[PDB]
Write a protein that binds this DNA or RNA. Structure first.
Ligand SMILES: N[C@@H](Cc1c[nH]c2ccccc12)C(=O)O
Ligand SMILES: N[C@@H](Cc1c[nH]c2ccccc12)C(=O)O
Lengths: 99, 104
DNA sequence: TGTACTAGTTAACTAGTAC
DNA sequence: TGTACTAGTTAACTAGTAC
């Protein structure tokens, strides 16, 4: 349950980040808290979710576009199935235009 | 460039996209479900540990070996924290001391 | 004391296959 | 066609050492 404790501290980080966006110090905050590799992997996961939601490529086509492993697409697929409907509709609105 | 340098710049842009989608998520109260979708459980937990280290290194009331023992961490993680703080803008450091320190 | 180093551990990754 | 699987690699981690 060292885990339960690390969970309450994660929530604290979410809160700090919220306050950083409000003061224009999100970038520097993220550069301190994440590693280069982690930032690159997050950039990728956003491309994956956006193209799954657009639905114009098969998952095989998408992994070849990205140079990703098919399991990584699958992770994106499975994570979208677990997300609340309101989030998925919100992403389709924002990612697929208008914003 | 027609090479390496340019490739780095693109990865950069894809990351800024994540930063902008999260901002928009906070404005709509969808930040939590968004971060549960975009990170893994092991990733959230690590972040939690990194914020505790930054806070305690700011505080300056515990030695580094003391911090490591408290958290069940390797001293090299504490070092990463220390070197990162050293590379941060002064402005960020001032704000963190301001928010975490007292408030916490 | 702070911080550079060595080792093995762990989980997200790319590459490819089974239905 | 999507998705559950098998491999090996990568990088942040814990544990421990040398100045
Ligand atoms: N919550 C997911 C996080 C994640 C890992 N890889 C991904 C691929 C794309 C989207 C999300 C993911 C487990
Ligand atoms: N920007 C750092 C991120 C980081 C990795 N490990 C850490 C430990 C504590 C604080 C920051 C971190 C590289």
């Amino acid at each position: 349950a060292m885990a339960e404790e690390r969970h309450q501290e994660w929530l604290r980080f979410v809160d700090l980040l919220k306050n950083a966006y409000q003061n224009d110090l999100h970038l520097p905050l993220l550069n301190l808290m994440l590693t280069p590799d982690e930032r690159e992997a997050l950039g990728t996961r956003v491309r994956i979710v956006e193209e799954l939601l657009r639905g114009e490529m098969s998952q095989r086509e998408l992994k070849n576009e990205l140079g990703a492993g098919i399991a990584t697409i699958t992770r994106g697929s499975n994570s979208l199935k677990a997300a609340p409907v309101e989030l998925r509709q919100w992403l389709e609105e924002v990612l697929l235009k208008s914003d």
